[PDB]
Amino acid sequence: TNLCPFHEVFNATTFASVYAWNRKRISNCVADYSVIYNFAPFFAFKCYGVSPTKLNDLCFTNVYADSFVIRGNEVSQIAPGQTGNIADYNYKLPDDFTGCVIAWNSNKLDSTPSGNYNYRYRLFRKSKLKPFERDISTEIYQAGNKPCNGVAGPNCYSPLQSYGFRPTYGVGHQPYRVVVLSFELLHAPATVCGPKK
């Protein structure tokens, strides 16, 4: 009977950085995905492992909403079988991904004339991320054989970098708020159904 708090995830005042993406489990509610369309035209509304015409006529054990902020030229990485700094080092989707990716422009909220600093992304990693893995480790990246001793320098780079979102950037470099809706099926009674049951 209760509606799923999808609006709370999309209407957050400040979104999380991609290296430290947020996650909320949606459970025991009616999932009417029309509530999210109060958020303007979407730059991307792509679903995988599921029929988009069935999004309001399906029951699942749980639904997961992962939210973060990337550049425009990086939204294509939030998809199964993709490469790049976001997919390799920040947020990785599995090949058998069952869900939808929803991205909209946030230049008017996530950019300042001086340059947004809190929105950061990981630039270096010794290995690619596993699907749905999260890396918040803040160690200096040792590119060579010489240890780094905890300070950046030659062949020793800080792993996290800021976007520096300014309003006068091109749309490819402007901030975009992404929400990844994950549909979970386990051998357990379903707690999230659509309005059409």
Epitope: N62, E133, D135, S137, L186
Partner: antibody
């Protein structure tokens, strides 16, 4: 008070069974996985498995697959650990520890640590 | 199944910096994050480090974690008498169905 309180000490004979309780409070019981770690006297820590209290799914260590059953009771926010065919080698302190990553997906699990720990339940196997 | 190798013992005088190594393989430390625990006598383990170098809320900044290859290391700078305890490393091992591997533990003795 985010807390894990376990049942009292147990003394059993070899071959018998024991069921240890682990009650959670101060947080949503189904948000976090629960681990089971035991420690023989004077020995190190040994991982026994995790259980997802949201679904009941488990992942036992290979050494305990067959003699150990983990269950949940969301009604009273209590996790149970039952060991069958108790050996003298099972005499140890049994801990329940909370998985420190919220909202895990069972089929895409990632272990990052155990933040909340219970006081332990002593199990002594003597004849 | 796997074994994370720690030095059996380690010592240091008050105020010094002590390091405790944790040697694993490619399927545990080389593939996953490393977390560290402190265990006082007659006490349940306490999380000191997680996600390689992150400290939980309330863990003093004199504790430091690091990961490199298939090895990890815990550093206790500004050693105090209260730091005398057993210290464990742990990491997920991707082998088989997956399992948490605890190190053998290292007993820290604050001399002086």
């Amino acid at each position: 008070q985010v807390q894990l309180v376990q049942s009292g000490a147990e003394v059993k004979k070899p071959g018998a069974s024991v069921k240890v309780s682990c009650k959670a409070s101060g947080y949503t019981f189904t948000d976090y996985f629960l681990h089971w770690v035991r420690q023989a006297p004077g020995q190190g820590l040994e991982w026994m498995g995790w259980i997802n209290p949201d679904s009941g799914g488990t992942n036992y260590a290979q050494r305990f697959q067959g003699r150990v059953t983990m269950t949940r009771d969301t009604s009273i926010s209590t996790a149970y650990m039952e060991v069958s065919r108790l050996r003298s080698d099972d005499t140890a302190v049994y801990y329940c520890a909370r998985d420190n990553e919220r909202y895990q997906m069972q089929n895409y699990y990632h272990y990052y640590g155990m933040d909340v720990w219970g006081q332990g339940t002593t199990v002594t196997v003597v004849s | 199944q796997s074994v994370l190798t720690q030095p059996p013992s380690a010592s240091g005088t008050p105020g010094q910096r002590v390091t405790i190594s944790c040697s694993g393989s490619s399927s545990n430390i080389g593939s996953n994050t490393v977390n560290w625990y402190q265990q006082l006598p007659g006490t349940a383990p306490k999380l000191l480090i997680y996600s390689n170098n992150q400290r939980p809320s309330g863990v003093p900044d004199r504790f430091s974690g690091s990961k490199s290859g298939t090895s990890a290391s815990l550093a206790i700078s500004g050693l105090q008498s209260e730091d005398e305890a057993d210290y464990y490393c742990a990491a997920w091992d991707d082998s088989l169905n997956g399992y948490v591997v605890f190190g053998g533990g290292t007993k820290l003795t604050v001399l002086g």
